Design a protein around this ligand. Structure first.
Ligand code: HNV
Ligand code: NI
Length: 158
C-alpha cells in the first residue's frame, strides 16, 4: 500500500508525509462553501490485492492558519459527512486493486461571521489530513500524513 499525488509526490510503503497544494475560490461569502476536493489529487493502491485487503480511514483532520480562525467546516469521507476538525476516526474504505483509486476526501469550509479581508493567505498551511492504513494480513498500521497548503489568497468580502 502506497499513495501518490497528481502533482506529484509520493508516500511509499510504510507511510510518511507529503505536502499538497490546493486551488481555492478567490472570493467566498458568508453562507457559501469553499470545496476542497482531495480525491482528484491523492491516489492510493494495494500492492498485493490477490491475498491482502487494505483498510483506509481518515484518522484525523485538523485545521490551521486562516482556516482554523476564519472558517467552520465539515469533511465528506467516502459518502458520509463529519465535523471538520474531526472528532473521531472514520469508518474504513477498502483498497483491493493495484490500480490507483482516489482517496475520497473533500472539505467544505464556510466563513464565520468575524471573517473579512484576506481570510486565507497564499502558500499558508490550511489543514492536515491523516490517512491510516491497516490490512487483514499482518500487524501493519501506518500513517500517511497530508499537509494541505493554499495555492492562492482567499478573500471574504466585507
Ligand atoms: C504470503 O506471501 C506474501 C505475500 C505478500 C506479502 C507482502 C507485502 C507488502 O506489504 C505492503 O503491501 C500490503 C498491501 O498493499 C500492505 O497491506 C502492507 O501494509 C504493505 O504496505 C508478504 C507475503
Ligand atoms: Ni505499488
Amino acid at each position: 500500500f502506497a499513495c501518490k499525488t497528481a502533482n506529484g509526490t509520493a508516500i511509499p510503503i510504510g507511510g510518511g508525509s507529503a505536502n499538497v497544494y490546493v486551488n481555492l475560490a478567490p472570493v467566498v461569502n458568508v453562507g457559501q462553501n469553499l470545496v476542497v476536493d482531495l480525491s482528484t489529487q491523492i491516489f492510493c493502491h494495494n500492492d498485493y490485492p490477490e491475498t491482502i485487503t487494505d483498510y483506509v480511514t481518515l484518522q484525523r483532520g485538523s485545521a490551521y492558519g486562516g482556516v482554523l480562525s476564519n472558517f467552520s467546516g465539515t469533511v465528506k469521507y467516502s459518502g458520509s459527512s463529519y465535523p471538520f476538525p474531526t472528532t473521531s476516526e472514520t469508518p474504513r474504505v477498502v483498497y483491493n486493486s493495484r490500480t490507483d483509486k482516489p482517496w475520497p476526501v473533500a472539505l467544505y469550509l464556510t466563513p464565520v461571521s468575524s471573517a473579512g479581508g484576506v481570510a486565507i493567505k497564499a502558500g499558508s498551511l490550511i489543514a492536515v489530513l491523516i490517512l491510516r492504513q491497516t490490512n487483514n494480513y499482518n500487524s501493519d498500521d501506518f500513517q500517511f500524513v497530508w499537509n494541505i497548503y493554499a495555492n492562492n489568497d482567499v478573500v471574504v468580502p466585507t
